[PDB]
PDB file of all heavy atoms in Angstrom:
ATOM      1  N   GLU A 877     -29.903  45.306  47.001  1.00 29.02           N
ATOM      2  CA  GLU A 877     -28.661  44.682  47.446  1.00 29.02           C
ATOM      3  C   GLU A 877     -27.460  45.181  46.661  1.00 29.02           C
ATOM      4  O   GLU A 877     -27.427  45.108  45.428  1.00 29.02           O
ATOM      5  CB  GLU A 877     -28.767  43.170  47.379  1.00 29.02           C
ATOM      6  CG  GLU A 877     -29.843  42.669  48.328  1.00 29.02           C
ATOM      7  CD  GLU A 877     -29.969  41.173  48.330  1.00 29.02           C
ATOM      8  OE1 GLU A 877     -28.974  40.502  48.665  1.00 29.02           O
ATOM      9  OE2 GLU A 877     -31.060  40.685  47.988  1.00 29.02           O
ATOM     10  N   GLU A 879     -23.347  45.772  45.597  1.00 29.96           N
ATOM     11  CA  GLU A 879     -22.165  45.028  45.267  1.00 29.96           C
ATOM     12  C   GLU A 879     -21.067  45.287  46.302  1.00 29.96           C
ATOM     13  O   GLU A 879     -21.006  46.371  46.882  1.00 29.96           O
ATOM     14  CB  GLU A 879     -21.653  45.449  43.882  1.00 29.96           C
ATOM     15  CG  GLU A 879     -22.628  45.133  42.759  1.00 29.96           C
ATOM     16  CD  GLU A 879     -22.822  43.657  42.584  1.00 29.96           C
ATOM     17  OE1 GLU A 879     -21.811  42.928  42.629  1.00 29.96           O
ATOM     18  OE2 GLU A 879     -23.983  43.217  42.455  1.00 29.96           O
ATOM     19  N   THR A 882     -14.431  47.058  46.812  1.00 29.00           N
ATOM     20  CA  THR A 882     -13.082  46.618  46.572  1.00 29.00           C
ATOM     21  C   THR A 882     -12.188  47.295  47.619  1.00 29.00           C
ATOM     22  O   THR A 882     -12.568  48.305  48.226  1.00 29.00           O
ATOM     23  CB  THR A 882     -12.606  47.058  45.177  1.00 29.00           C
ATOM     24  OG1 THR A 882     -12.614  48.495  45.092  1.00 29.00           O
ATOM     25  CG2 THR A 882     -13.507  46.472  44.086  1.00 29.00           C
ATOM     26  N   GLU A 884      -7.813  48.236  47.863  1.00 28.32           N
ATOM     27  CA  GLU A 884      -6.505  48.174  47.250  1.00 28.32           C
ATOM     28  C   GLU A 884      -5.585  47.346  48.110  1.00 28.32           C
ATOM     29  O   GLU A 884      -5.673  47.386  49.349  1.00 28.32           O
ATOM     30  CB  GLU A 884      -5.909  49.573  47.097  1.00 28.32           C
ATOM     31  CG  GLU A 884      -6.737  50.506  46.238  1.00 28.32           C
ATOM     32  CD  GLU A 884      -6.944  49.958  44.849  1.00 28.32           C
ATOM     33  OE1 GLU A 884      -5.951  49.680  44.152  1.00 28.32           O
ATOM     34  OE2 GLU A 884      -8.107  49.795  44.456  1.00 28.32           O
ATOM     35  N   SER A 887       1.609  43.979  48.906  1.00 36.17           N
ATOM     36  CA  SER A 887       2.265  42.773  49.398  1.00 36.17           C
ATOM     37  C   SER A 887       3.712  43.098  49.698  1.00 36.17           C
ATOM     38  O   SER A 887       4.288  43.938  49.032  1.00 36.17           O
ATOM     39  CB  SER A 887       2.167  41.650  48.356  1.00 36.17           C
ATOM     40  OG  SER A 887       2.955  40.529  48.734  1.00 36.17           O
TER      41      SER A 887
ATOM     42  N   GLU B 439       0.176  36.727  54.746  1.00 36.85           N
ATOM     43  CA  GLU B 439      -0.450  36.836  53.420  1.00 36.85           C
ATOM     44  C   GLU B 439      -0.999  35.499  52.928  1.00 36.85           C
ATOM     45  O   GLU B 439      -2.051  35.458  52.306  1.00 36.85           O
ATOM     46  CB  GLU B 439       0.536  37.391  52.391  1.00 36.85           C
ATOM     47  CG  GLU B 439       1.199  38.685  52.829  1.00 36.85           C
ATOM     48  CD  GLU B 439       1.991  39.352  51.735  1.00 36.85           C
ATOM     49  OE1 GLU B 439       1.940  38.863  50.586  1.00 36.85           O
ATOM     50  OE2 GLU B 439       2.673  40.369  52.038  1.00 36.85           O
ATOM     51  N   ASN B 517     -12.928  54.172  51.810  1.00  3.88           N
ATOM     52  CA  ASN B 517     -13.908  53.085  51.858  1.00  3.88           C
ATOM     53  C   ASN B 517     -14.297  52.727  53.296  1.00  3.88           C
ATOM     54  O   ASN B 517     -15.462  52.418  53.575  1.00  3.88           O
ATOM     55  CB  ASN B 517     -13.350  51.846  51.134  1.00  3.88           C
ATOM     56  CG  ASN B 517     -13.284  52.019  49.615  1.00  3.88           C
ATOM     57  OD1 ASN B 517     -13.709  53.039  49.073  1.00  3.88           O
ATOM     58  ND2 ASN B 517     -12.735  51.014  48.922  1.00  3.88           N
ATOM     59  N   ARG B 550     -10.670  52.146  39.594  1.00  2.00           N
ATOM     60  CA  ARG B 550     -11.065  51.699  40.925  1.00  2.00           C
ATOM     61  C   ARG B 550     -11.517  52.864  41.811  1.00  2.00           C
ATOM     62  O   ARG B 550     -12.569  52.803  42.449  1.00  2.00           O
ATOM     63  CB  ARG B 550      -9.961  50.832  41.538  1.00  2.00           C
ATOM     64  CG  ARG B 550      -9.937  49.448  40.892  1.00  2.00           C
ATOM     65  CD  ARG B 550      -8.690  48.642  41.197  1.00  2.00           C
ATOM     66  NE  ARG B 550      -8.724  47.994  42.509  1.00  2.00           N
ATOM     67  CZ  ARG B 550      -9.371  46.864  42.793  1.00  2.00           C
ATOM     68  NH1 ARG B 550     -10.087  46.238  41.866  1.00  2.00           N
ATOM     69  NH2 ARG B 550      -9.323  46.369  44.028  1.00  2.00           N
ATOM     70  N   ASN B 604     -24.286  48.553  41.275  1.00  2.00           N
ATOM     71  CA  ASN B 604     -24.479  49.716  42.125  1.00  2.00           C
ATOM     72  C   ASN B 604     -25.112  50.915  41.360  1.00  2.00           C
ATOM     73  O   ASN B 604     -25.869  51.713  41.936  1.00  2.00           O
ATOM     74  CB  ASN B 604     -23.171  50.066  42.831  1.00  2.00           C
ATOM     75  CG  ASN B 604     -22.861  49.116  43.988  1.00  2.00           C
ATOM     76  OD1 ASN B 604     -23.703  48.315  44.403  1.00  2.00           O
ATOM     77  ND2 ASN B 604     -21.646  49.207  44.513  1.00  2.00           N
ATOM     78  N   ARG B 639     -28.329  35.800  41.855  1.00  2.00           N
ATOM     79  CA  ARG B 639     -29.469  35.891  42.747  1.00  2.00           C
ATOM     80  C   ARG B 639     -29.751  37.336  43.176  1.00  2.00           C
ATOM     81  O   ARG B 639     -30.905  37.747  43.229  1.00  2.00           O
ATOM     82  CB  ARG B 639     -29.237  34.979  43.961  1.00  2.00           C
ATOM     83  CG  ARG B 639     -30.499  34.542  44.685  1.00  2.00           C
ATOM     84  CD  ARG B 639     -31.037  35.630  45.598  1.00  2.00           C
ATOM     85  NE  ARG B 639     -29.967  36.252  46.386  1.00  2.00           N
ATOM     86  CZ  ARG B 639     -30.062  37.425  47.008  1.00  2.00           C
ATOM     87  NH1 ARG B 639     -31.193  38.129  46.978  1.00  2.00           N
ATOM     88  NH2 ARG B 639     -29.014  37.890  47.684  1.00  2.00           N
TER      89      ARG B 639
END
Side-chain angles (χ1 to χ4, degrees):
Chain A
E877 297 181 60
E879 297 295 317
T882 61
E884 300 302 303
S887 172
Chain B
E439 308 190 6
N517 289 357
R550 285 166 80 80
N604 284 349
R639 203 281 315 162

